[PDB]
Write a protein that binds this ligand. Structure first.
Ligand SMILES: O=C1N[C@]2(CCOc3ccc(Cl)cc32)C(=O)N1c1cncc2ccccc12
Ligand SMILES: O=C1N[C@]2(CCOc3ccc(Cl)cc32)C(=O)N1c1cncc2ccccc12
Lengths: 304, 304
């Protein structure tokens, strides 16, 4: 019992964190096999960030200008290439701690763990979600770039995010491990607005199921609704539209609690329309949307 | 920018997690040097838990009845002893992954990271605090016993908690690594009520400082207060009394923001008396008390 914003164990990802320095810029890199992945803005000065031409900036860089340090030892860079917004630095040594891994591009609403790093050293681990506007509400200071987001499936690490940027609004932007930004963000110090941060409806529902499983049942009501009626209310409250796919994905939680998905939707509808009235659900005074249905099943069943 | 409930990287603690089986009971153990630490209730059956006499139950156990498994390999138990509510199993092999470590007994209000484990395998990591009633609001299923709480200071892991019990109220109870329970809890399946769960005032204040640092300033007011006046209001709201030690501990956050501690106290006082009015602070609709002043300084400065 108890429900916590839980992150995946970070050991497997800690074994991959290295420091990459180019000129005066130092950020983090991810060392998997004989390649070190890092944000391409490592080649930029703070003046370059206003309007960088990464191809031209990269021409003035050779293998020896990229200083890669793993722990306290220097890695020899035998090649370098730019793939979208990331640099791939080929080193002569394969990482002996390379876990089984995949590079995945997640969809908005999906959650992942972030290992915040500085100078190739891990400082903390937290859980977050890819917002529907393709930003992440992270915790990153200067020097955190190159910190990664990942999920673990038993022994396979699926790397889904690499930190690149903080927007003027305090939200974060980054890429998948192929260098493609999530959302319309570009690695430039220019005016970039995030877009409407809507609530991940299916995750809120999953978290309502988690509360029922853990004993918080005050919000359960005598009502039901339809997908269309619920969506009318969801639109008004800037909630993502709920589809039949979402209902299907909530099926195992619905089965475990004996509460039909549309009944939980009517409970959520009354919570949006009437508020919490000073009450809490799983020790929270707002509706939490950063647990997917898979996270709730995982946490409530103890998958290791 | 951004403020997240961040846990310490868990790699160093993952390298210590083993599975301990005695009879039909399987729980987690912590392997440091040639000793495996685990809850003594590993020797109990579910019937034994009602009224166990651990000394008598232990007499019927020999070294070979404790099955210790690290990863996929079995450790040879060459000795066993009971120290308060923990068993120490001496094994013939020192853990090659033993980090630098200490065993510490924390005070209520102090925070730590938990690596929730099942069958000696880590499943997740989260941050929590030792509540003023000596319980922890964790996330633990059956089989999680022996999961540990720790803090990391650069390379030294200070182990402060070992999970033992879940109370009928869904809160958790456990010991330090010397086997002494936090609070008045005993390792028995008997009626045990936690006590008043008060709010950790100094942590709430620290988190208000974190919000100011990260831009959430709406709650800052034109008022001030005194320690005695603030404490009158704090008592009414079941908040821990604020002492001069707490004011001193908040000094570096006070210095960074230019907001005197007593001014932040008057802001908190108005928040307790008038509520949030549908507003949020650091994306939260309630006052968060599970970040110490040290955690805020650490997160906001990037200590690795
Ligand atoms: O290190 C960098 N360089 C920046 C500086 C601004 O101009 C740009 C523009 C584009 C890109 Cl890709 C990065 C950058 C950036 O946001 N970050 C930071 C990342 N995350 C958090 C930060 C917290 C404080 C300070 C800087 C942080
Ligand atoms: O594994 C055990 N044995 C228990 C069973 C109850 O009687 C006692 C009495 C004292 C002690 Cl020390 C432990 C135990 C206990 O609480 N836990 C559990 C720990 N944490 C979470 C649990 C979630 C579900 C189920 C059991 C959980």
């Amino acid at each position: 019992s108890g429900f916590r914003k839980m992150a995946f164990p970070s050991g497997k990802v800690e074994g991959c964190m290295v420091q990459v320095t180019c000129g005066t810029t130092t950020l983090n890199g991810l060392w998997l096999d004989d390649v070190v992945y890092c944000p391409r803005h490592v080649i930029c000065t703070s003046e370059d960030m206003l309007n960088p031409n990464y191809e031209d900036l990269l021409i003035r860089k050779s293998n020896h200008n990229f200083l890669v340090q793993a722990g306290n030892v220097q890695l020899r860079v035998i090649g370098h290439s730019m793939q979208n917004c990331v640099l791939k630095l080929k080193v002569d040594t394969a990482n002996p701690k390379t876990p089984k891994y995949k590079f995945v591009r997640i969809q908005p609403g999906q959650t992942f763990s972030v290992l915040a790093c500085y100078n190739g050293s891990p400082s903390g681990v937290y859980q977050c979600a890819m917002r529907p506007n393709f930003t992440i509400k992270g915790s990153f200071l200067n020097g955190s770039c190159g910190s990664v987001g990942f999920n673990i499936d038993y022994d396979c690490v699926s790397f889904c995010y690499m930190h690149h940027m903080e927007l003027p609004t305090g939200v974060h932007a980054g890429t998948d491990l192929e260098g493609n930004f999530y959302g319309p963000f570009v690695d430039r110090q220019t005016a970039q607005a995030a877009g409407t941060d809507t609530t991940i409806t299916v995750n809120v529902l999953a978290w309502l199921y988690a509360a029922v499983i853990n004993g918080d049942r005050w919000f359960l009501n005598r009502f039901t609704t339809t997908l269309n009626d619920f969506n009318l209310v969801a639109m008004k409250y800037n909630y993502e539209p709920l589809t039949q796919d979402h209902v299907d994905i909530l099926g195992p939680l619905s089965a475990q609690t004996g509460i039909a998905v549309l009944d939980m939707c009517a409970s959520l509808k009354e919570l949006l329309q009437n508020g919490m009235n000073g009450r809490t659900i799983l020790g929270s005074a707002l509706l939490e949307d950063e647990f997917t249905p898979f996270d709730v099943v995982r946490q409530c069943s103890g998958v290791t």
